[PDB]
Write an enzyme that holds these catalytic residues in place. Structure first.
Site, PDB file in Angstrom:
ATOM      1  CE  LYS B  50      30.039  37.109  53.602  1.00  0.00           C
ATOM      2  NZ  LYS B  50      29.616  38.364  54.281  1.00  0.00           N
ATOM      3  CG  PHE B  91      46.228  34.638  40.679  1.00  0.00           C
ATOM      4  CD1 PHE B  91      47.591  34.450  40.817  1.00  0.00           C
ATOM      5  CD2 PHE B  91      45.790  35.720  39.936  1.00  0.00           C
ATOM      6  CE1 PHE B  91      48.502  35.357  40.259  1.00  0.00           C
ATOM      7  CE2 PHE B  91      46.703  36.635  39.394  1.00  0.00           C
ATOM      8  CZ  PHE B  91      48.047  36.457  39.567  1.00  0.00           C
ATOM      9  CG  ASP B  96      47.328  39.701  47.883  1.00  0.00           C
ATOM     10  OD1 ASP B  96      48.399  39.831  47.218  1.00  0.00           O
ATOM     11  OD2 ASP B  96      46.266  40.295  47.606  1.00  0.00           O
ATOM     12  CG  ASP B 100      49.056  39.601  54.069  1.00  0.00           C
ATOM     13  OD1 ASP B 100      48.993  38.390  54.374  1.00  0.00           O
ATOM     14  OD2 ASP B 100      48.091  40.246  53.607  1.00  0.00           O
ATOM     15  NE  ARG B 105      42.743  35.468  51.939  1.00  0.00           N
ATOM     16  CZ  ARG B 105      42.482  36.775  51.888  1.00  0.00           C
ATOM     17  NH1 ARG B 105      41.231  37.209  51.833  1.00  0.00           N
ATOM     18  NH2 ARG B 105      43.471  37.656  51.920  1.00  0.00           N
ATOM     19  CG  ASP B 167      48.397  47.564  50.113  1.00  0.00           C
ATOM     20  OD1 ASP B 167      48.111  48.652  50.696  1.00  0.00           O
ATOM     21  OD2 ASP B 167      48.045  46.443  50.544  1.00  0.00           O
ATOM     22  CE  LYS B 193      45.660  44.555  48.435  1.00  0.00           C
ATOM     23  NZ  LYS B 193      46.873  44.254  49.251  1.00  0.00           N
ATOM     24  CG  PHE B 232      33.274  47.047  48.720  1.00  0.00           C
ATOM     25  CD1 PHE B 232      32.160  46.537  49.366  1.00  0.00           C
ATOM     26  CD2 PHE B 232      34.387  46.227  48.570  1.00  0.00           C
ATOM     27  CE1 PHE B 232      32.134  45.215  49.811  1.00  0.00           C
ATOM     28  CE2 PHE B 232      34.361  44.900  49.013  1.00  0.00           C
ATOM     29  CZ  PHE B 232      33.229  44.402  49.613  1.00  0.00           C
ATOM     30  CG  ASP B 236      36.641  45.862  54.151  1.00  0.00           C
ATOM     31  OD1 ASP B 236      35.905  44.957  54.606  1.00  0.00           O
ATOM     32  OD2 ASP B 236      37.879  45.754  54.054  1.00  0.00           O
ATOM     33  CG  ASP B 237      39.854  50.607  54.845  1.00  0.00           C
ATOM     34  OD1 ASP B 237      39.911  49.400  54.505  1.00  0.00           O
ATOM     35  OD2 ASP B 237      40.468  51.515  54.259  1.00  0.00           O
TER      36      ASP B 237
HETATM   37  O1  LIG Z   1      33.947  38.404  48.640  1.00  0.00           O
HETATM   38  C1  LIG Z   1      32.736  38.584  48.562  1.00  0.00           C
HETATM   39  O2  LIG Z   1      31.986  37.835  47.750  1.00  0.00           O
HETATM   40  C2  LIG Z   1      32.074  39.649  49.414  1.00  0.00           C
HETATM   41  C3  LIG Z   1      32.384  39.754  50.784  1.00  0.00           C
HETATM   42  C4  LIG Z   1      31.761  40.737  51.568  1.00  0.00           C
HETATM   43  C5  LIG Z   1      30.833  41.615  50.983  1.00  0.00           C
HETATM   44  C6  LIG Z   1      30.200  42.619  51.743  1.00  0.00           C
HETATM   45  C7  LIG Z   1      29.297  43.516  51.148  1.00  0.00           C
HETATM   46  C8  LIG Z   1      29.031  43.405  49.774  1.00  0.00           C
HETATM   47  C9  LIG Z   1      29.654  42.403  48.993  1.00  0.00           C
HETATM   48  C10 LIG Z   1      29.308  42.297  47.545  1.00  0.00           C
HETATM   49  C11 LIG Z   1      27.968  41.941  47.255  1.00  0.00           C
HETATM   50  C12 LIG Z   1      27.539  41.813  45.925  1.00  0.00           C
HETATM   51  C13 LIG Z   1      28.456  42.039  44.884  1.00  0.00           C
HETATM   52  C14 LIG Z   1      29.798  42.396  45.149  1.00  0.00           C
HETATM   53  C15 LIG Z   1      30.693  42.626  44.085  1.00  0.00           C
HETATM   54  C16 LIG Z   1      32.020  43.011  44.344  1.00  0.00           C
HETATM   55  C17 LIG Z   1      32.486  43.121  45.660  1.00  0.00           C
HETATM   56  C18 LIG Z   1      31.595  42.918  46.720  1.00  0.00           C
HETATM   57  C19 LIG Z   1      30.244  42.530  46.493  1.00  0.00           C
HETATM   58  C20 LIG Z   1      30.560  41.493  49.594  1.00  0.00           C
HETATM   59  N1  LIG Z   1      31.170  40.506  48.863  1.00  0.00           N
END
Ligand SMILES: O=C(O)c1ccc2cccc(-c3cccc4ccccc34)c2n1
Ligand SMILES: O=C(O)c1ccc2cccc(-c3cccc4ccccc34)c2n1
Lengths: 343, 343
Positions: B50, B91, B96, B100, B105, B167, B193, B232, B236-237
């Site tokens: 993303k 990297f 990772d 694992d 991915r 981890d 991590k 965050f 996520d979990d």
């Molecule tokens: O791997 C990615 O790019 C990714 C994948 C899924 C996500 C689900 C929600 C928010 C972010 C996200 C949005 C904006 C800035 C961010 C900065 C650090 C980490 C996450 C951020 C997100 N990011």
């Protein structure tokens, strides 16, 4: 000799290196268990080798720095930087042993082959690399050569990594193709994978520590050192097969492992089309009957004699290089190292 | 929004990043084949995500630098540094996924799982790391923040690597021990991590690029950002199991993989001794009958409600942190990022 004496003071410094790298556990108890694993990775992997690369940093430092600037702290820094070269090396070997499915290294089980390690050793090798920059920060942050050393270690890692890419591309696992075992390719692998980190990096680190930061001075030392690196690897491949294991302390497996050895390169350059087939059928096999056959083909093609002539030409070249490029560095920086390398 | 617009200009910069990293092939044809492999590693691994972390560098740069100092070159540097964050990430993920034994991915086959890659991906992941410093050298060598960025990237790699050690130590492959799935341990894993590289690194890089190199300023942003990182990963979990796969774009496997999830930590904190056994028997198994049972235990222990309360408390905390620690940075640096993270 310059090395054998210093070896003791160098190896004794390791205990401080480990203590210092495990000292951030004090402020952060949370990562204690990770730090305990780091200590174990360091102890297992940075010890047991000959320490020559790390020692070259120290020996060159003493020869490039005026004795009045060789105070207790300058010296702690020399040993630390030497240990950084060894940590760079420990990081490559941990990673390379995983990649080529190695079982042992210097008579002991490869770290990844240890029960309960496996592929976690990939993270362990990354930690070994991280430790170089932690040491440079801890010991050399306030020194004018700090950034110069960081960039040299990073560039040396990059060059080695590119060297490993070339190597992995030249001799893939389950791929016996002698078409890509050219002289030009061999020379590049040695240059990138071994020569830079093994020969250029140690002297270059001592040079920066000495305030010898000139681009031409480094280009001149590199010119000498990369040739030393090329001879060292050509001599190693030769001794792998034709050397005596009781003197070398190693039994040659280059033929069994489809390695892009100087010996195979020379065989391929000389071999008739029928001899090319004889090599095609026997190169890369585990059987001692087929291992004996490749050796007999090399001996037929007079490769021990080609090596003898290469040794003589190489010696004249390295001396021509020392005479032309050592200045303004004392030729003893390069000569002491050549003596350790050339027989 | 700040991101969605910039995403295009960011992704378009990749082609220049790749060209620039493959441009040393010109002077050194010898390493061409290795450079071709590097290009392929970059194209496969740095694309398809993303780009939010890399984008955060760019967004924060625009918000921390006066528009008159946002010239063409300053901007090329912002995108490059953003790409460095993505390369650091590429990297870690390549490494990772090997560690694992991941199969996929972001819907594609993991790089090491590609035919003819395998364990060579260890060298490929090292190359991705090397590329950060090559880019910093190529674009930022003459900038006063050069060393600051090198040290931040190296420290962030170290912290992530320590995080990965923790981890790997907490949840080994073939080891179901819930005794080590403590709150304190969970928080440390996330911190080391994920949090540092994901949240602290992007803003900190933009901050240095803006000349905000103050230790207190960085400590203050870190205080905010590590909390953002902790929420965050907790979110996520939670979404891994209780989230809708059609919205999250992922199907949760945390239970099947014996992950040290916030959900397991909370379950373990609440569970009676009989419920501890129910979890012991079903946590880490591939069977959908046992996966349904752990979920039912979490739902019984009211964890979606514990998460709801955590979400509310977390929101008040991050706002308290922003108010107390943003200054002198514009709160919009942190708010824009929080909005993207918190729902
Ligand atoms: O791997 C990615 O790019 C990714 C994948 C899924 C996500 C689900 C929600 C928010 C972010 C996200 C949005 C904006 C800035 C961010 C900065 C650090 C980490 C996450 C951020 C997100 N990011
Ligand atoms: O891994 C080691 O330490 C090692 C192992 C075997 C060796 C066989 C001959 C010479 C050296 C040797 C001696 C002195 C300095 C050196 C610097 C760079 C590379 C090799 C050096 C050697 N070194």
């Amino acid at each position: 000799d310059v090395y054998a004496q210093e070896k003791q003071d160098f190896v004794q410094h390791f205990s401080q290196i480990v203590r210092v790298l495990t000292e951030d556990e004090m402020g952060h108890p949370e990562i204690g268990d990770a730090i305990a694993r780091l200590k174990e990775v360091l102890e297992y992997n940075a010890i047991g080798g000959k320490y020559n690369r790390g020692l070259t940093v120290v020996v060159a430092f003493r020869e490039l720095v005026e004795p009045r600037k060789q105070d207790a702290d300058s010296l702690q820094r020399a040993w630390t930087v030497g240990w950084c070269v060894e940590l760079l090396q420990a990081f490559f070997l941990v990673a390379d042993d995983i990649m080529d499915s190695s079982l042992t290294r210097r008579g002991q089980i490869c770290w990844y082959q240890k029960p309960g390690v496996g592929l976690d050793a990939i993270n362990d090798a990354n930690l070994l690399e991280a430790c170089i920059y932690r040491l440079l920060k801890l010991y050399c942050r306030e020194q004018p050569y700090y950034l110069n050393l960081i960039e040299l270690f990073l560039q040396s890692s990059y060059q080695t990594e590119i060297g490993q890419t070339l190597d992995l591309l030249t001799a893939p696992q389950g791929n016996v193709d002698l078409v890509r075992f050219t002289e030009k390719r061999y020379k590049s692998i040695v240059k990138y994978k071994t020569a830079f980190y093994s020969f250029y990096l140690p002297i270059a680190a001592a040079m920066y520590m000495a305030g010898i930061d000139g681009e031409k001075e480094h280009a001149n030392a590199k010119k000498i050192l990369l040739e030393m690196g090329e001879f060292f690897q050509i001599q190693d491949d030769y001794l792998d097969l034709f050397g005596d294991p009781s003197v070398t302390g190693k039994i040659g497996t280059d033929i069994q492992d489809n390695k892009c050895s100087w010996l195979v390169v020379q065989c391929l350059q000389r071999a008739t089309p029928e001899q090319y087939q004889i090599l095609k059928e026997n190169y890369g096999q585990k059987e001692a009957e087929k291992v004996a056959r490749v050796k007999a083909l090399y001996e037929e093609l007079d490769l021990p004699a080609v090596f003898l002539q290469y040794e003589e030409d190489s010696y004249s070249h390295i001396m021509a290089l020392i005479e032309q490029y050592a200045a303004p560095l004392p030729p003893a920086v390069f000569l002491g190292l050549a003596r350790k390398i050339y027989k």
